[PDB]
Ligand binder design. Structure first.
Ligand SMILES: *[C@@H]1O[C@H](CO)[C@@H](O[C@@H]2O[C@H](CO)[C@@H](O[C@@H]3O[C@H](CO)[C@@H](O)[C@H](O)[C@@H]3O)[C@H](O)[C@H]2NC(C)=O)[C@H](O)[C@H]1NC(C)=O
Ligand SMILES: *[C@@H]1O[C@H](CO)[C@@H](O[C@@H]2O[C@H](CO)[C@@H](O)[C@H](O)[C@H]2NC(C)=O)[C@H](O)[C@H]1NC(C)=O
Ligand SMILES: *[C@@H]1O[C@H](CO)[C@@H](O)[C@H](O)[C@H]1NC(C)=O
Ligand SMILES: *[C@@H]1O[C@H](CO)[C@@H](O)[C@H](O)[C@H]1NC(C)=O
Lengths: 50, 46, 46
């Protein structure tokens, strides 16, 4: 309470950097990028053996 | 005042309201002040 | 006193230092029990 103006200002500043850093590092979503890469490529080599 | 704890003045908390904090040591003491002031009236009676 | 609790004497703890403990009952007493001593002199002194 004695620091809520500071705490509310610091939280919104920290949550604003999430919107920038997610669209900065490319491999941030690499955890979800390779779950669709592995399934599509194994699908690709499945039809490549026909 | 034992259920609560204090910190600083009341000019910094947003949304603070006005109420009375009941000190429990006072009415045991202040009723004893009434007996003591009666005793001090008894002390100055003769 | 409301921030500290006691257990035994002060010779067995390694590294204990010397300081006083501000008892909050005393300002509620030394502003009022000493006020009785002034009321004692209301009749005894003259
Ligand atoms: C905190 O304060 C206390 C005071 O209560 C200090 O205790 C004092 O400790 C010294 C240690 O040398 C005592 O001196 C010795 O006393 C014995 C008798 O008990 C005597 O035979 C020796 O020749 C010597 O004079 C001193 O008496 C004692 N104070 C009291 C009132 O008994 C304690 O050392 C302090 N601690 C710190 C960390 O400052
Ligand atoms: C709680 O009580 C205090 C004590 O009166 C109020 O503080 C005063 O409020 C008046 C407004 O009516 C001001 O003119 C004074 O300058 C204030 N004094 C101080 C020392 O702050 C306070 O407003 C009350 N709280 C509420 C919510 O009414
Ligand atoms: C801390 O350790 C040093 C080195 O052993 C020693 O001289 C000192 O007395 C110790 N401090 C306390 C409070 O025991
Ligand atoms: C002494 O007692 C009288 C009444 O008993 C009182 O009016 C007076 O104020 C007292 N003296 C002091 C110094 O309080």
């Amino acid at each position: 309470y004695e620091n809520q103006k500071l705490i509310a200002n610091q939280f919104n500043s920290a949550i604003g950097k999430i919107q920038d850093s997610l669209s900065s590092t490319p491999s941030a979503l690499g955890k979800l990028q390779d779950v669709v890469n592995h399934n599509a490529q194994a699908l690709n080599t499945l039809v490549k053996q026909l | 005042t034992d259920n609560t704890f204090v910190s600083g003045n009341c000019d910094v908390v947003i949304g603070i309201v006005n109420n009375t904090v009941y000190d429990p040591l006072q009415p045991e003491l202040d009723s004893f002040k009434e007996e003591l002031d009666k005793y001090f009236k008894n002390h100055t009676s003769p």
